[PDB]
Amino acid sequence: LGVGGLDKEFTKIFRRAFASRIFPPSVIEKLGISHVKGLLLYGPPGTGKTLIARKIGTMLNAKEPKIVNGPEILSKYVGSSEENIRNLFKDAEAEYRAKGEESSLHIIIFDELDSVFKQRGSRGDGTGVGDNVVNQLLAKMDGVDQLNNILVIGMTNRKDLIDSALLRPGRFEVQVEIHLPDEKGRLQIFDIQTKKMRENNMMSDDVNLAELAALTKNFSGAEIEGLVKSASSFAINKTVNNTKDIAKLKVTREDFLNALNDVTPAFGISEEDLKTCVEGGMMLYSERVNSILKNGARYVRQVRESDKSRLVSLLIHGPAGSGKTALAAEIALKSGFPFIRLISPNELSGMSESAKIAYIDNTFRDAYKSPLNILVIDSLETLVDWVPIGPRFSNNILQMLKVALKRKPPQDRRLLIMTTTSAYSVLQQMDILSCFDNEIAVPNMTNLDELNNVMIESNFLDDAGRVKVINELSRSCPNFNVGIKKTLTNIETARHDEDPVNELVELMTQSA
Amino acid sequence: LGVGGLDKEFTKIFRRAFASRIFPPSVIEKLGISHVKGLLLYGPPGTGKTLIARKIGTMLNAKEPKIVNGPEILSKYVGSSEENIRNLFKDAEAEYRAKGEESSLHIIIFDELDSVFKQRGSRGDGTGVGDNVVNQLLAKMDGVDQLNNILVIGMTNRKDLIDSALLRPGRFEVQVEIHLPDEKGRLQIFDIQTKKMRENNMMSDDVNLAELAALTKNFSGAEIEGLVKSASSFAINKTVNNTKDIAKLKVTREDFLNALNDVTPAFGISEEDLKTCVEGGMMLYSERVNSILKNGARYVRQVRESDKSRLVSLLIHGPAGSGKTALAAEIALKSGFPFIRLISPNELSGMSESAKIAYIDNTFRDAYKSPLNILVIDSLETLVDWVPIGPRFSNNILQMLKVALKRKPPQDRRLLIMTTTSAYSVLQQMDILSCFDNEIAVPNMTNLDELNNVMIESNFLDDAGRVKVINELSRSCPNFNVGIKKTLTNIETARHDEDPVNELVELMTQSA
Ligand SMILES: Nc1ncnc2c1ncn2[C@@H]1O[C@H](COP(=O)(O)OP(=O)(O)OP(=O)(O)O)[C@@H](O)[C@H]1O
Ligand SMILES: Nc1ncnc2c1ncn2[C@@H]1O[C@H](COP(=O)(O)OP(=O)(O)OP(=O)(O)O)[C@@H](O)[C@H]1O
Ligand SMILES: Nc1ncnc2c1ncn2[C@@H]1O[C@H](COP(=O)(O)OP(=O)(O)O)[C@@H](O)[C@H]1O
Ligand SMILES: Nc1ncnc2c1ncn2[C@@H]1O[C@H](COP(=O)(O)OP(=O)(O)O)[C@@H](O)[C@H]1O
């Protein structure tokens, strides 16, 4: 005991990796079988793998597990690395000659395994550093030097990089996956972490753990440890400057609520980028805008409450300066989904091409590990480096994006994608219009009534003047055609001049 | 005894490689012949090669075979690699001086042979690691230092890489192939594996091995051994938590049936990818769909009960959104074949060009080792990276695929191939249309009756409302042209709205 939220996995591991070790050697001999010598656990970081490995050892009363780290061995000098691997198994070798089939169990943990394979074959074999450890390790548990006391546990974050040679029977025969916890699991983790405080009357009676289990929506276990530590920090600092009356120390609900603002999770919301940069006003100057927002809300609920629709892709298009991005963000912030991210040119500035591919792929990879997700892609045509003189563009990134937009996430998960563009004709010429499930159009302003609404909404000036602007434009140029960004960047400059009324009309004539 | 399914090969090996060692030396000298010093076995892994190697030795009462692993020798430092070969034969050299012609037989096993040749000539010769072992090895069995007590066995999974110089007489004269077992072979392997349970009264009376032999369709030996071990795991875990009344332990049929869900074989069915990703509905909305499914069933039965047709290939083509892939998958799952795989852009994402070529070639190789096989190739034009601005595309992959679609499998095996494409004219220009034997076209929806059927079958809403949609469309736009995918996306997006009828009408008019 000491682990929460992983009952089913625990039963599965114990049935296969350890159950046969409990029985006396006689019956195992009489059945005619041989023990399992490899187990592979995979999943995201900070989720509780090493803890399971450690706690299973305590029931069997084996020795304390030895631990080894991948880059440690790989980074040492060649000769030392070659000599190192033989030093790990010495104790297990000795006890076998001592006691044979009655020997006690020895458990070895191997961490960041994939790092050994993550290199080109030429460098791995010519240098030999990558291949040497793998070969010696397989020799010690499969070949003629077979040693019958050991059990090896390997831990990885990316299963697809492990070579298939290692997965066949006789080597790493059992594989298990660990998931981010759900609400009930987090309730248990909170209990395990606050037990010691609760049992010494150092925790206040206003704390309700069921509510915290609902606020911490997409957290892992390590994050919960951090949250408790920060809460305790509040209570400790309130008394220092070391004083009398330490015996009345107690943590309180306010401490936790303030703690939430200091620990931010991975797999969370990129709040600042969406809120500040992309949204500096929202005003309902026409019926079309309200229509667009209602359609967006439709799609959000559609994704949230159906099992047929687990991938929806949309394209928002229109002229430059119309409003696209701000709309996308506005749809995202009202959703309430736990996971939201955006890919934009700002993030990829200053990189080489290969780096760009790696970044995009890791982002999509991370989107596949939570129950609900949203992704925003900004200005597709710029990510591909389009210039029309050549024309010139990067084909590899285009193919990466083309494949990513159609793939479906695994195991009853679901995501939504929004993308924004200003060069619809180019996308038509590159024939990737078959990826998007629906299209939305954003038009400019073309009636003077809309202008009046915008002026009313931004507190331009009293009615008497706003009438004059419309009257002058009525026969200056009644057929104008301008976006919203420009209109709201001409009102700003007009306000700080000496003749507001005569300045805005001229700027509007010029833009049209 | 201890091996099953390989009687013919046992006879043929014993007749050539060993029969001469039994006779007294007088008669062998008296005929004037010489013993054979090389034997090569090739076949897929986990099929029983080292087993036969060990078992043949115990009849002759030779010394326990020494074993050496290729990459082990190649990965060591250069000096020790050159020195170590000479240590392998030391004992054999000793006994020859000791006793002369009357010595006993010495048997040396060499594993993963092809690895030594799998390198460029420049690196192999300049470094010398690859060439040195080969040269020193041939010296000991062919040259003036010929040693007359040894026998060398080579073991490899790919014969095409071994150089033709080694196979000539005096070196590795005899070559043999190992196959995956057929039904009777599996029936024998089960007996060999379950003997010790049966002889100690630890196996129930309901287990019938003839049924298990028929369920496990493309298993090799190692998978059958793992299957027995997993069933034992079930029987053991049911008591723990180590108790009284261990003596009544017994395995049972339920355990085997449950064990089938835990061991998944190579050369099996990739169920999840075909089932989940590709099929999220199937509804018979017209006569053309019935016709297509019936044609597919026809071809399957053709491939299964004829000797003249050992290779068939089909092309399914039509507009984007028509239904293609889901059809292919539907035809595949109903077939009941043992082996099914598919190649799609998802598996090849993020690879270099050389890696892609290697992956495709390995897949086609793995297809040629079972009686019946199905392959599905999805979105051909995306595999080649087509973009029409240049145009730009990869020529090497195209030539690889063009060769692969005509090659016929060896030795009375047979396969069926299906491929899907949306760019028929592009392939017309590439001139690869001569590879396919038949062509199927999938059309779009063009009648209101079909739409009625689709609405009825998806439970859209009660009849009273269902009639009104058809009424309104009958005079809004009677000549519409839309695929199935977009229809089933508009339906769902109209169920979660406040006025389903108007919303559906507007969307469907826009798509048409
Ligand atoms: N109703 C509205 N719709 C859209 N944007 C609005 C609205 N009201 C105010 N705005 C503001 O107007 C600005 C619109 O500029 P935005 O960056 O979204 O343009 P864009 O279409 O993405 O153009 P670009 O081609 O330059 O990327 C934002 O600051 C947004 O907050
Ligand atoms: N009778 C049917 N025929 C084909 N597809 C059907 C049928 N009934 C339902 N569907 C559904 O139609 C959906 C769309 O089909 P599918 O994904 O195979 O299209 P596609 O031709 O591969 O398109 P793309 O151009 O995107 O590659 C599938 O999810 C399938 O489940
Ligand atoms: N399921 C869990 N229950 C309780 N504590 C957990 C859990 N998962 C992680 N932890 C906390 O995480 C810390 C160690 O996690 P760690 O060993 O880093 O996992 P990983 O295998 O991801 O490295 C411990 O201090 C432990 O309290
Ligand atoms: N044809 C067979 N008959 C009996 N046992 C087999 C057979 N094939 C494989 N096995 C099982 O496989 C194990 C050894 O296979 P292995 O020596 O790894 O063959 P190879 O490595 O040459 O493919 C043994 O435990 C044996 O019980």
Q: Is B45 annotated as a binding residue?
A: yes
Print burial letters for B476-485: b (CB count within 10 Å at least 16), e (below 16): eeeebebbbb
Give A105's DSSP letter.
Answer: P
Nearest CB neighbour to B389, from listed A34, A357, A429: A429
Of B452, B454, B461, give the one whose Cα is nearest residue B494.
Answer: B461
Between chains, do B388 and A128 touch, taking CB under 8 Å as contact? no
CB neighbour class for A35 (10 Å; exposed up to 12, middle 13-18, buried from 19): middle
Per CB-CB distance under 8 Å, the chain A contacts of B249 are 27
User: Sign of torsion, CA B136 B142 B148 B149?
Assistant: positive
Q: Which experimental technique did the depositors report for determining this structure?
A: cryo-EM
Question: Which residues, including other chains, have CB under 8 Å from residue B270's CB and lie 6 or more apart?
Answer: B340, B341, B342
* DSSP per position, B88-145: HTHHHHHHHHHHGGGPPPEEEEEESTHHHHSS-HHHHHHH-HHHHHHHHHHHHHHSTT
User: Sign of torsion, CA B72 B73 B74 B79?
Assistant: positive
Q: Is B336 annotated as a binding residue?
A: no
**Ligand 1 mean position to A504 CA, how many Å?**
20
CA distance A435 to chain B (A): 10
Print burial letters for B51-78: b (CB count within 10 Å at least 16), e (below 16): ebbeebbeeeebeebebbbbbbbbbbee
The encoded tokens of residue B336 equal: 């009941």
**Residue pointed to by tokens 């038009």:** A443
Question: Which residues, including other chains, have CB under 8 Å from residue B344's CB and lie 6 or more apart?
Answer: B377, B378, B379
Q: How many Å apart are CA A312 and CA A342, to the nearest integer?
A: 16
The encoded tokens of residue B45 equal: 């892994």
Q: How many Å apart are CA B501 and CA B207, to the nearest integer?
A: 60
Alpha helices in B146-252 (DSSP H): 183-198, 209-215, 221-237
**Phi and psi, residue B385, nearest 5°:** 70, 50
Of A281, A283, A285, A284, give the one whose Cα is nearest residue A448.
Answer: A285
Per CB-CB distance under 8 Å, the chain B contacts of A404 are 349
User: Sign of torsion, CA B399 B403 B406 B412?
Assistant: negative
The residue of chain B nearest to residue A167, with distances taken between CA atoms, is B266
Residue of A282, A294, A386 best suited for mutating to test ligand 1, as the one with most atoms within 8 Å of CB: A282
**Residue pointed to by tokens 């070639």:** B361
CA distance A172 to chain B (A): 12
- Note whether B359 and B347 are within 8 A (CB): yes
Nearest CB neighbour to B46, from listed A22, A34, A168: A168
The residue of chain B nearest to residue A426, with distances taken between CA atoms, is B389
**Ligand 4 mean position to B4 CA, how many Å?**
10
**Ligand 3 mean position to A168 CA, how many Å?**
30
Q: Is B322 annotated as a binding residue?
A: yes
| Distance (Å) of CA B323 to CA B279, B328, B422 | 10, 9, 11
The residue of chain B nearest to residue A133, with distances taken between CA atoms, is B75
Q: How many Å apart are CA B134 and CA B131, to the nearest integer?
A: 5
Q: Which residues of A are annotated as a binding site for ATP?
A: 43-50, 318-325
Our answer on whether the CB atom of B138 is closer than 6 Å to any ligand 4 atom is no
Q: How far apart are the first and last CA of chain B?
A: 73
Between chains, do A169 and B486 touch, taking CB under 8 Å as contact? no
Q: How many Å apart are CA B480 and CA B511, to the nearest integer?
A: 8
- C-alpha angle B17-B223-B152 in degrees, rounded to nearest 5: 20
**Ligand 3 mean position to A6 CA, how many Å?**
12
Between chains, do B226 and A132 touch, taking CB under 8 Å as contact? no
Q: How many Å apart are CA A221 and CA A154, to the nearest integer?
A: 20
- Note whether A78 and A129 are within 8 A (CB): yes
Print burial letters for B434-456: b (CB count within 10 Å at least 16), e (below 16): ebbeeebebebbeeeebbeebbe
- Note whether A473 and A459 are within 8 A (CB): no
Q: Is B281 annotated as a binding residue?
A: no
Our answer on whether the CB atom of A470 is closer than 6 Å to any ligand 3 atom is no
Nearest CB neighbour to B492, from listed A128, A306, A395: A306
The encoded tokens of residue A129 equal: 């550093």
The residue of chain A nearest to residue B350, with distances taken between CA atoms, is A400
Our answer on whether the CB atom of B49 is closer than 6 Å to any ligand 4 atom is yes
Ligand closest to A275 (CA) is 1
Q: Which residues of A are annotated as a binding site?
A: 43-50, 318-325
Our answer on whether the CB atom of A189 is closer than 6 Å to any ligand 3 atom is yes
Per CB-CB distance under 8 Å, the chain A contacts of B422 are 434
Q: How many Å apart are CA B283 and CA A111, to the nearest integer?
A: 49
- Note whether B181 and B7 are within 8 A (CB): no
Strand partners, B417: B313, B375
Per CB-CB distance under 8 Å, the chain B contacts of A353 are none
Q: Is B47 annotated as a binding residue?
A: yes
Strand partners, A68: A110
**Residue pointed to by tokens 């050539």:** B16
Per CB-CB distance under 8 Å, the chain A contacts of B492 are 302, 306, 308-309
CA–chain centroid gap for B70, Å, is: 24
Nearest CB neighbour to A395, from listed B226, B385, B486: B385
CA-based radius of gyration for chain A: 31
Ligand closest to A330 (CA) is 1
* DSSP per position, B452-473: HHHHHHHT-S-HHHHHHHHHHH
Strand partners, B269: B340
Atom of ligand 3 nearest to the CA of A192: 4
* DSSP SS3 for B40: strand
CA distance A159 to chain B (A): 14
Q: How many Å apart are CA B406 and CA B390, to the nearest integer?
A: 30
Question: Which residues, including other chains, have CB under 8 Å from residue A51's CB and lie 6 or more apart?
Answer: A2, A3
Our answer on whether the CB atom of A250 is closer than 6 Å to any ligand 1 atom is no
Nearest Cα residue to atom 22 of ligand 1: A325
In chain A, after which residues does the backbone break, taking C–N over 2.5 angstroms as a break? Answer: 241
The residue of chain A nearest to residue B486, with distances taken between CA atoms, is A437
Q: How many Å apart are CA B233 and CA B291, to the nearest integer?
A: 49
Our answer on whether the CB atom of B43 is closer than 6 Å to any ligand 4 atom is no
- Note whether B2 and B55 are within 8 A (CB): yes
**Ligand 2 mean position to B282 CA, how many Å?**
9
The encoded tokens of residue B139 equal: 């010296």
CB pairs under 8 A between A and B: 116
Alpha helices in A164-264 (DSSP H): 183-198, 209-215, 221-237, 253-259
CA distance B233 to chain A (A): 6
